[PDB]
Structure formats: C-alpha cells, structure tokens
C-alpha cells in the first residue's frame, strides 16, 4: 500500500500502448487501476497538503485518458462526472472541457456542449478547426 507508487507509471505506459493499438476497453482497465493506486495513496495524505495536491495532479491526465476510452466506447455518464470533478478544481483544463463538451453533445445537452466548446476556444484558439467540426455537427442536430 505504498510500494506501488512505482507501479503507476508502468501501468500508465501499458494503458497508453493498449490505447494506441486500438485495445481501448483494456486500456480503460489499466487507467482505472493506475487511478485506484494513486487515490489510495492520496487517501493517506491530508487534503490540501503538497503531497495530496501532487497526487491529485498525477491523477488528472490518467483520469482524462480513462474518459477518452469511455468516449470511444460511447459511455458518456462517467465522462460527464469525471470531467466536471477535474474542472471544479482546475478550471483551465482544455481537454476536460473538450471531452465534457463531446459527452454533453452525445447526450443532447446542446447548451452545455456549446458552453464547454466555447471555453475550449477561449483557452486555446488554435483548436478552432476541430471545435468548429464538433459545433457544426451539434448545430445540424439543433436544426433538427
């Protein structure tokens, strides 16, 4: 229950390679495990302490990876919650707004989707082409 801080980066790496190979359901499992490991360590730290914060920041990219797997397998409810949790702490996280926007769109929360995509553009205008595609799609569906 502490000698597996060393496992995390390896599990992380295996997840990434699975994802890249197209084994997305299995990458999700890996990310989930890496996350559980980090959270257990974090449970041993005082919230708001430097160690707690460092672990929280290590979880974020792993939790986003997990959400990305969930987008691919078309399961949106965890994406919404996990991204919202990240965003309630780190409100400048571009990937989190983007994934949450996609999940909102998939479940027909058009207004909420637009709000998140707008935020993505405010933080990274270089994303205009991809965001515009997502919004174009969305807008078509709003047209009915």
């Amino acid at each position: 229950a502490e000698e597996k801080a060393k496992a995390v980066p390896l599990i992380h790496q295996e997840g990434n390679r699975l994802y890249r190979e197209g084994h997305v359901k299995e990458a999700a499992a890996k990310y989930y495990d890496a996350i559980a490991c980090l959270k257990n360590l974090q449970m041993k730290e005082q919230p708001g302490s430097p160690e707690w914060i460092q672990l929280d920041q290590q979880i974020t990219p792993l939790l986003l990876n997990y959400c990305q797997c969930k987008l691919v397998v078309e399961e949106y409810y965890e994406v919404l919650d996990h991204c919202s949790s990240i965003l309630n702490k780190y409100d400048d996280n571009v990937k989190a707004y983007f994934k949450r926007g996609k999940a909102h769109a998939a479940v027909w929360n058009a207004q909420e989707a637009q709000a998140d995509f707008a935020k993505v553009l405010e933080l990274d205008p270089a994303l205009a082409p991809v965001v515009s595609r997502e919004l174009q799609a969305l807008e078509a569906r709003i047209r009915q």
């Binding site: 997840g15 990434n16 994802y19 890249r20 990458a27 990219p61 986003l64 990876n65 990305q68 990937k95 983007f98 994934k99 994303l127 991809v130």
Partner: peptide, 7 residues
C-alpha cells in the same frame, strides 16, 4: 496535443 490522443 490532439484531443483524441492520450496524455
């Protein structure tokens, strides 16, 4: 980098 990429 890309939105679909992990990390």
């Amino acid at each position: 980098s890309r939105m679909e990429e992990v990390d």
